[PDB]
Amino acid sequence: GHMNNLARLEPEVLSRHAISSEQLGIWYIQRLEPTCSAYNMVVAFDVKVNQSLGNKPIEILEAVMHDYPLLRVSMPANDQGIEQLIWDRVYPNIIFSDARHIEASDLTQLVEQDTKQPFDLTQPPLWRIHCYECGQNHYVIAFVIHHALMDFWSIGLLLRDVSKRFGLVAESDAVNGIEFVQYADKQQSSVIDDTDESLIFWKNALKHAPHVHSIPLDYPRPAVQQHKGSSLVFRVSESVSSGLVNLAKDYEITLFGLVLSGFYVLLHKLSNENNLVIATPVAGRLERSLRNALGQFVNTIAIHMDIDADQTLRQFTQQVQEQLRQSLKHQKIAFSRVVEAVSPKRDGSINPLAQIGMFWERLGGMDEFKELLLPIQTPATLVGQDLTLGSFPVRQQEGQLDITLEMGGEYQGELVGVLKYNTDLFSAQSAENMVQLLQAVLSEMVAHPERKIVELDIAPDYKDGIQFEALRGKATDYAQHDLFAMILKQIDERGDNHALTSHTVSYRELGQHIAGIAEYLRAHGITQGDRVGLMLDRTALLPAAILGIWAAGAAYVPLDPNFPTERLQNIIEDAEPKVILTQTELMDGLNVSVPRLDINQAGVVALEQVRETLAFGDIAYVMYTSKPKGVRIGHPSIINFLLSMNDRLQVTTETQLLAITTYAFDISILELLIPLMYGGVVHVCPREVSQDGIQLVDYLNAKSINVLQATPATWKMLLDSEWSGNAGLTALCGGEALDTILAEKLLGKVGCLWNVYGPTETTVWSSAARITDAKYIDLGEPLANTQLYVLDEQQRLVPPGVMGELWIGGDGLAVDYWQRPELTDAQFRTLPSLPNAGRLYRTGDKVCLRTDGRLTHHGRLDFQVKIRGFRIELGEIENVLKQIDGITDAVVLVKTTGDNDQKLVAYVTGQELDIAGLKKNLQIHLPAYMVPSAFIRLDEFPMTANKKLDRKAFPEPIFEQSNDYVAPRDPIEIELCTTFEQILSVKRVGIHDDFFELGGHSLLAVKLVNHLKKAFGTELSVALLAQYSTVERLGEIIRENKEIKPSIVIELRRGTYEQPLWLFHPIGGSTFCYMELSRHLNPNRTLRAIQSPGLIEADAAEVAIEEMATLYIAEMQKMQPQGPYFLGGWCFGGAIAYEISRQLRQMGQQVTGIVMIDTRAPIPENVPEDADDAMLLSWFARDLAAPYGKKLTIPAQYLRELSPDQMFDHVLKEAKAINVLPLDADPSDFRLYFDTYLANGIALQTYFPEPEDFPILLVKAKDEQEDFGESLGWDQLVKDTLTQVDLPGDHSSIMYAENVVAVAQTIDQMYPIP
């Protein structure tokens, strides 16, 4: 053993101190997430020794521990505060392991693993040393200090002092290792009132600062931050580094000033937000008396820049330097204090106020060590007589924020930096991107110093004219091919084989039907260029009609008969068709001034006889979409589309496609034609079957389909039926976003799955993704002769990792919007930015260009996904809901409320649901900012005629503004409430009020938790309180826990006066009736109330009052062993007080007085009427709810009709339904209440004390209708010493807020305290 001669001894505390406010925040984070290593400071060395080193290391270590008290510090959390304890002695935590067998690559990983082991800041030491034997006289030494204990400036002082001790440097400055606790103490004897001019500065600085930054993430953000992260080391070139130095001097700014400005500009371009908040450390060592002190002095300041893209870099950089200069005036105010004052919404998913940092450190005086402290390895050594030090870089302090930029170092003319990134949010490829973008910003800054921020472009020199070569589609001549010729060829070749299946039509028969329809049309006025309305049912004539209309030279305009007549009529108005091809039934359905042809009258004609006359025209169809927008599509688009689709689907003679989509939706083009291009079979699915889950499942298992295309809706319908899947099926899902849940479900049921995307204006689909893993969904890669561009609002190309608007170019563009040329000219453009792109369609889709060539969809621009600044990943919320058992489908929308405020609304459908528990579920899987403010259940989500979700149709939500007040309903909620009220100084806390929203803040939480694990006697944590911030939610957690029984004593108020007032429970056993009283009593008096054991442990309620009283007096005396006692109670509690007084005086104790609030004297006359079990249960139900001002009337006669077990269930169900029992109350819990009621009843019936003269304040409820005498009987027990006051109220309401104030004040006037 390497510590054989150090020896372990028993440490004792020398002195207690405060923690500085600079330590409080880091301490709290460590206590909030115990496995956090993000504040493990590491400095490590390659150490070669000589024989002469000897035992000097232990000798020196022991000397250093003696010299600097700070190293023997612990930070335990105690009563009403966190403490800094200096121990006389600490056993050093030195770990020595054999690494002689470990390759150098692995050794680094190992040291990084080892140093991340988390500290408990309450068990010393808060530092440790890791040694590795690498070879003989060859070691790696890693020193690890928790940042709560000291800062890097301190590390420097130690490094230099300890180096001198080992004889590595000649000189060392004096180090002070005791000043910090003094500094801590003098600090926490000071206020920082909310009037402090610096505190006001930060509130103003940060008031309008966003909740969370809008950089797009790679992953979905965890509900609770786990501080996992990684680091990327990079260097800025000598050219660009020198440039920066000079540019800074060519302005009036710090180098740091410059680079920070660079950083903001980067985040501006990355997130496209103009409000940005970056956090920077400050040394916090202005007082020179501190410049040699070991300690944690570093404060964080949150700089909040407003970016004006119109600013020149020069103007803007200076604007930063200035604000930075102002902010440094107010660095004295701790970040924890700023967070307290600003009071942002607490959210366990992010750091408050700021999630991006920039550290700039150079640290002078460390001249010999400068290269030994870089993030990169250097040949630099320190040679001493006994040993040599060498560079050993290890990744350290990862996970603090979302992103932290760490800079200040320089090496061989190059600025050295470390990009730190949270690995739960960002991929490594994204980090590299960020570094590359950062590099680009600094270059373009020294290049073009006078340029306007907006005109500055970070994005890669896309020399090819494309952002990635993926986003450009394979070049062919598909758009030149003849579609008609292919189908004609198949008609010759395939012969009498099947073609359509509705009454099966052969290819030969199909040719006849095309001829016959085309000829019929020709005969009745139709020519090339005309437009034919097409109003048909899903028969075998449908595809024949399309091809017939085409062969006649005409274009068809879909008029689906299932669409609303006024919708059909609007299209017909706009499209102005020459005729409408329809069937016999439908001829005079529409009231339109447009001729109609019964397609059933078209004959069959031999194709041979009319082939010369058959040609396609230029236009294929006019398809309408969301005034009416008819998109005109030409045949070269369509043939380009179909051929490009065959490339993927590999359509063959044995292909068999179930066509289900309306021909009034362009994607039907694929389903109706592409088998006919290759000899396969189109199955025209009848509308009824496509809209009926089981009926569709049936037609699938039967007719042996191997290709199916549909929108998500149909797939969901299919899965919601008992569909066994089809492992040969090729599936296409398009038209709407494929969420990860459907994807993982589809994948397990289908052979091949395609996500397929495209607007109508670029011909069915433009791109397609072969989906293989649900966690990776995107818009795929382009079809042939198609190009995809992601542009900003300036129609410039975006940098990778940035969101923009998708634009599409290629052979797929529409001809135009039908007779809407202004619109066409606005939507179909060439762009100066893309001069080789040609004509482009502008989708109005929000698409993120990934660091990958991947396009991920984020849905439109007309749809608001912004709230309070930051933006919402609506799909991530939806994904969670769907995973909840019961929920079948969910849609989350952003909606506006009253004063231009936006809130999340979640719509759900499902078999059986409990809206109540939904919010609690989401709370523990999403960030706070992504939790919906409203849950609306629907039977079915509204669809479009296309079978997509019709978001515009979802009902507008109605928000509950304030949270409804609800009084605590059980002993746990009762204590929790009192505890909240007291700590927050809030007069009255409801069980749905949230700790932090009531004014709570992080240091208070620690107090609260400390108060609780005394009051409950178990280990509660600040994480629990963080995640469960309401009495209700927290009550649940505590309650579920079988290892925690409360005390029968509740402190309602700790006052200053010596003497407590003790209150005793009424018949029910609870102390709720005293809560409101306690709020109006003079707060200088301590109040304690006792509840029955019976409410906590089973069969524990006492049944004789005399025994009850003894038990309670013992409980009392543990807190108040002597003095004269002050007792009282409402109702039965008064009688308990009477008997307690009797026993107290038999013990020689004095009783100052008894408060009785409408107590009926314990005399025979006042005993209740005899009740059967039903009546007792009826009474209990009444008395249970009365304290809450609620009337719960359960007639004994109703109860007698039921069996006993049915009775208790009935009362329980009824009590819960008016909210006077917690929602999770088992029958077990209910028997606890009822049994206590029964016990106290029996006690009442057997208690009849002899007369006795105690000083009694009898407060009579002067409005109670039941008669018990002027004195409620007390004149028979107490003659001379009874003071009676009659006050407004009845026996119950006397204790209600309106009436109980006068009760409280009667007491305070009668039993005064200074």
Ligand X SMILES: CCCCCCCCCCCCCC(=O)OC[C@H](COP(=O)([O-])O)OC(=O)CCCCCCCCCCCCC
127 contacts ligand X (rule: CB under 6 A): yes
97 contacts Ni ion (rule: CB under 5 A): no
> Would you give the end-to-end CA distance of the chain in angstroms?
66
List interacting residues with Mg ion (CB under 5 A): 759-760
* CB 769 to ligand AMP: min, Å: 8
| Residue pair 1109/1244 in contact by the 8 Å Cβ criterion | no
Tell me whether residue 127 or residue 1247 sits nearer to ligand X (CB atom): 127
Please name the residue that has the structure tokens 């320190």. Answer: 382
Residues within window 599-658 making contact with ligand AMP, judged by CB under 6 A: 625-626
Residues within window 854-873 making contact with ligand AMP, judged by CB under 6 A: 857
The item of Mg ion, ligand X, ligand AMP, none sharing an interface with residue 845, based on CB under 5 to 8 Å by kind, is ligand AMP
Phi, psi of 1003 (to 5 degrees): -60, -40
The item of ligand AMP, Mg ion, Ni ion, none sharing an interface with residue 843, based on CB under 5 to 8 Å by kind, is ligand AMP
- Select from 898, 909, 912, 910 the least CA-distant residue to 957: 898
Of 1-9, 424-432, 528-536, 1202-1210, the window that binds Ni ion (rule: CB under 5 A) is 1-9
- Select from 170, 199, 507, 134 the least CA-distant residue to 329: 199
Binding-site member from 89, 94, 628, 647 for ligand X (CB under 6 A): 94
Tally Cβ neighbours within 10 Å of residue 317.
Answer: 28
* CB 744 to ligand AMP: min, Å: 17
Whole-angstrom distance, CA of residue 1099 vs CA of residue 1115: 19
61 contacts ligand X (rule: CB under 6 A): yes
Binding-site member from 432, 736, 1229, 1263 for ligand AMP (CB under 6 A): 736
* CB 41 to ligand X: min, Å: 9
* CB 998 to ligand AMP: min, Å: 43
| Residue pair 705/729 in contact by the 8 Å Cβ criterion | yes
Tell me whether residue 204 or residue 626 sits nearer to ligand AMP (CB atom): 626
* CB 130 to ligand X: min, Å: 9
Interaction pattern, residues 406-445, with ligand AMP; x per rule: CB under 6 A: ----------------------------------------
Whole-angstrom distance, CA of residue 554 vs CA of residue 565: 24
| Residue pair 632/818 in contact by the 8 Å Cβ criterion | yes
**Interface size with ligand X, residues (CB under 6 A):** 25
* CB 764 to ligand AMP: min, Å: 10
Tell me whether residue 143 or residue 907 sits nearer to ligand X (CB atom): 143
- Select from 271, 427, 432 the least CA-distant residue to 775: 427
2 contacts ligand X (rule: CB under 6 A): yes
Q: Across the chain, which distance is largest between two alpha carbons, in Å?
A: 128
The item of Mg ion, Ni ion, ligand AMP, none sharing an interface with residue 295, based on CB under 5 to 8 Å by kind, is none
Written as six digits, the tokens of 505 are 């039509």
Binding-site member from 36, 43, 651, 1221 for ligand X (CB under 6 A): 43
Tally Cβ neighbours within 10 Å of residue 5.
Answer: 8
Cα dihedral 393, 395, 401, 407 in deg (nearest 10): 20
Of 43-51, 176-184, 1033-1041, 1123-1131, the window that binds ligand X (rule: CB under 6 A) is 43-51
Whole-angstrom distance, CA of residue 1192 vs CA of residue 985: 33
The item of ligand X, Mg ion, ligand AMP, none sharing an interface with residue 737, based on CB under 5 to 8 Å by kind, is ligand AMP
- Select from 795, 808, 805 the least CA-distant residue to 762: 808
The item of Mg ion, Ni ion, ligand X, none sharing an interface with residue 141, based on CB under 5 to 8 Å by kind, is ligand X
Written as six digits, the tokens of 754 are 């395609």
Residues within window 613-672 making contact with Ni ion, judged by CB under 5 A: none
Tell me whether residue 3 or residue 1167 sits nearer to Ni ion (CB atom): 3
Buried b (16+ CB within 10 A) or exposed e, 1250-1265: eeeebbbbbbbbeebe
DSSP code at position 1250: P
818 contacts ligand AMP (rule: CB under 6 A): no
* CB 808 to ligand AMP: min, Å: 10
* CB 381 to ligand X: min, Å: 12
1054 contacts Ni ion (rule: CB under 5 A): no
737 contacts ligand AMP (rule: CB under 6 A): yes
759 contacts ligand AMP (rule: CB under 6 A): yes
Amino acid type, 583: Q
47 contacts ligand X (rule: CB under 6 A): yes
Whole-angstrom distance, CA of residue 678 vs CA of residue 217: 44
| Residue pair 610/515 in contact by the 8 Å Cβ criterion | yes
DSSP code at position 1279: S
2 contacts Ni ion (rule: CB under 5 A): yes
Binding-site member from 57, 281, 357, 734 for ligand AMP (CB under 6 A): 734
DSSP conformation letters of 869-908 = SSB--HHHHHHHHHTSTTEEEEEEEEEEETTTEEEEEEEE
Tell me whether residue 292 or residue 726 sits nearer to ligand X (CB atom): 292
* CB 661 to ligand AMP: min, Å: 13
Whole-angstrom distance, CA of residue 311 vs CA of residue 261: 12
Angle, nearest 10°, between helix axes 1073-1080 and 971-984? Answer: 10
Phi, psi of 619 (to 5 degrees): -95, 140
Please name the residue that has the structure tokens 């693993």. Answer: 113
Of 87-95, 410-418, 615-623, 754-762, the window that binds ligand AMP (rule: CB under 6 A) is 754-762
The item of ligand AMP, ligand X, Mg ion, none sharing an interface with residue 1285, based on CB under 5 to 8 Å by kind, is none
1 contacts Ni ion (rule: CB under 5 A): yes
Whole-angstrom distance, CA of residue 1185 vs CA of residue 1202: 22
Interaction pattern, residues 136-175, with ligand X; x per rule: CB under 6 A: ---x-x-x-x---------x--xx--xx--x---------
3-state secondary structure of 1170: coil
Whole-angstrom distance, CA of residue 359 vs CA of residue 363: 12
Report angle CA 1018, 1061, 1289 to the nearest 5 degrees: 110
The item of ligand X, ligand AMP, Mg ion, none sharing an interface with residue 626, based on CB under 5 to 8 Å by kind, is ligand AMP
* CB 664 to ligand AMP: min, Å: 11
| Residue pair 560/572 in contact by the 8 Å Cβ criterion | no
Return all residues near 926 (Cβ < 8 A) that are at least 6 apart: 223, 349, 876, 877, 880
C-alpha pair distances (Å), 158 with each of 37, 130, 161, 773: 22, 17, 5, 52
**Interface size with Ni ion, residues (CB under 5 A):** 2
* CB 51 to ligand X: min, Å: 11
C-alpha 1003 chain-centroid distance = 23
Amino acid type, 791: L
64 contacts ligand X (rule: CB under 6 A): yes
Binding-site member from 20, 843, 851, 1086 for ligand AMP (CB under 6 A): 843
* CB 1 to ligand X: min, Å: 7
Footprint of Ni ion on this chain (CB under 5 A)? 1-2
Binding site for ligand X (CB under 6 A): 2, 43, 45, 47, 49, 57-58, 60-61, 64, 94, 96, 127, 129, 131, 139, 141, 143, 145, 155, 158-159, 162-163, 166
* Interface ranges with ligand AMP (CB under 6 A): 625-626, 734-737, 755-757, 759, 843, 845, 857
